């Protein structure tokens, strides 16, 4: 009879405990292992994978592939913002359902840079130039290209580069940010503007589309596992 | 810095209620049964379905709670209640009544647990015939490309029966067993898109189409 | 089945006990530390600081 004193927490079933348990199938010869392709070791391996962004969330487009299409057209003007969404990878509808956003919705904190890849799917004869800008928070969404041009920006010439990758940097007061919306952990606004109007020749379409892809950079991590708000149940599926 | 908490082991290795059922004290045939699948609950199903092939051991936690049901007797005294959970692997004899011979569990593993104690727990190995559990199956059960289509041509994990070992109490007691799965030592392959549309049936992927994401007004809206 | 004998005091929650407990958030990557000025290690560090004394406690 070894003297013992049970401490608080005895007879306790904590969901996230890691104790050893007796086997119900002693001496079971497991079926051997096979080298199946595509081993996953971390969920960031998935979060690092580019997935198409539904930038055009418009009510009518969301139930079609038109949501992923960013309309661009030949114009009489300049500046002329093409799109703008806040940098809420896990909250805003633009990103929360992406691959990256889906993974972020199972965690509470996130931190790191983000790859925004833009691919121009217009005619081979179309040319132009765009300003991809990330404006950190503190000032409202950039209203004109002049305002957007002060923050981190990139001049993307469509013609030499069919695709252009913008690595939005991690500029935050804190080491991490909330996946859910909080005006404390603000992320900024991502805008795009016309740098030089889309010039097109004769007898080819003047209106084209762009596709947006979101991935995580090499310095991206998530924290505080949690349940996703996306899946809901009211009875046992059968 | 570290991506530690985003490893597959941390992601999946948290207990989750996969099903819960009820049985009654004397009743007549007051035993419960459950064919073991992982697709009746939404949360665990989505976490597992983020991958096409999985391989892992399991931690089974049972949370069994009882409640007094109405009765006509004067001051019914509840003696402590014991429960038996029996596992019938596919092909074994099946309890047809609360007092069946199958409950002898000469070979079939089973747990006997008395109320008021720590929840019973059991680890179980990788019980698959193949070299990995299959989350999806783009095929049929019959070689004539007929019969069944989906993962329910693979799912054959046996049944799980529940009963009161105590019985005959002068007042009725209804009990609720809640099964909890926790994958240990996990190995995953071939990640696939997260589930978008709400689950509809446990035996197939059938879904009702829904939109890609939430909606905003304009492309410049913030 | 190791023989054991429970001693008095088991299943007891003493406010000032110092036992180890299982973590609810395994593998949680804490934010790194920062050298914030004015770290206190003992409340005597506070008590040793001069503070004005209300010698004239008169009601008014």
């Amino acid at each position: 009879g070894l003297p013992v004193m049970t401490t608080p927490g005895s007879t306790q079933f904590l969901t996230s405990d890691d104790f050893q348990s007796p086997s119900a199938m002693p001496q079971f010869d497991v079926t051997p292992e096979m080298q199946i392709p595509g081993r996953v070791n971390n969920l960031m391996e998935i979060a690092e994978v580019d997935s198409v962004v539904p930038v055009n969330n418009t009510e009518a487009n969301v139930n079609s592939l038109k949501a992923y299409q960013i309309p661009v057209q030949s114009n009489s003007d300049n500046g002329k913002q093409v799109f703008g969404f806040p940098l809420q990878p896990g909250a805003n509808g633009v990103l929360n359902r992406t691959l990256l956003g889906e993974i972020l919705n199972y965690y509470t904190h996130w931190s790191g840079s983000i790859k925004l890849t833009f691919m121009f799917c217009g005619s081979a004869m179309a040319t132009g130039k765009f300003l991809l800008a990330y404006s950190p928070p503190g000032a409202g969404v950039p209203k004109n290209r002049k305002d957007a041009m002060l923050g981190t920006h990139v001049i993307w010439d469509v013609g030499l580069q069919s695709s252009c990758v913008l690595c939005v940097p991690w500029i935050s007061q804190t080491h991490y940010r909330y996946v859910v919306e909080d005006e404390y952990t603000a992320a900024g606004y991502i805008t795009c503007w016309y740098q030089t109007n889309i010039v097109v020749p004769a007898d080819v379409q003047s209106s084209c589309d762009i596709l947006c892809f979101v991935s995580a950079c090499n310095d991206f991590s998530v924290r505080m596992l949690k349940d996703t708000p996306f899946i809901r149940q009211d009875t046992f599926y059968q | 810095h570290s991506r530690s908490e985003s490893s597959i082991e941390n992601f999946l290795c948290r207990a989750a209620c996969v099903y819960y059922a009820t049985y009654t004290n004397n009743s007549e045939k007051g035993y419960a049964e459950w064919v073991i699948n992982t697709r009746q609950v939404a949360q665990l199903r989505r976490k597992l379905e983020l991958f096409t092939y999985l391989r892992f051991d399991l931690e089974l936690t049972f949370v069994i709670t009882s409640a007094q049901q109405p009765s006509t007797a004067t001051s019914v005294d509840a003696p402590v209640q014991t429960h038996q959970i029996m596992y019938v692997p596919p092909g074994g004899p099946v309890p047809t009544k609360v007092t069946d011979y199958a409950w002898q569990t000469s070979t079939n593993p089973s747990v006997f647990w008395t109320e008021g104690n720590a929840p019973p727990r059991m680890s179980i190995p990788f019980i698959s015939i193949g070299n990995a559990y299959s989350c999806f199956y783009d095929g049929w059960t019959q070689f004539s490309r007929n019969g069944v289509y989906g993962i329910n041509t693979l799912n054959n994990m046996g049944t799980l029966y529940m009963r009161h070992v105590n019985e005959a109490g002068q007042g009725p007691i209804k009990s609720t067993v809640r099964i909890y799965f926790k994958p240990k030592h996990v190995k995953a392959w071939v990640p696939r898109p997260p589930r978008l549309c709400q689950y509809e049936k446990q035996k197939n992927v059938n879904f009702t189409p829904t939109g890609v994401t939430t909606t905003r007004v304009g492309i410049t809206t913030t | 089945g190791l023989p054991v004998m429970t001693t008095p005091g088991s299943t007891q929650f003493l406010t000032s006990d110092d036992f180890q407990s299982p973590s609810a958030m395994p593998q949680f990557d804490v934010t790194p530390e920062m050298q914030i000025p004015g770290r206190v290690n003992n409340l005597m560090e506070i008590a040793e600081v001069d503070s004005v004394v209300p010698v004239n406690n008169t009601e008014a």
């Binding site: 104790f19 050893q20 199938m25 001496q27 | 082991e9 680890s123 179980i124 190995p125 240990k184 030592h185 | -």
Partner: peptide, 17 residues
Amino acid sequence: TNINYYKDAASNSANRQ
């Protein structure tokens, strides 16, 4: 310090590290 008490590998704790 981590010692495994059971004869079966399935009985062990998670591979957290």
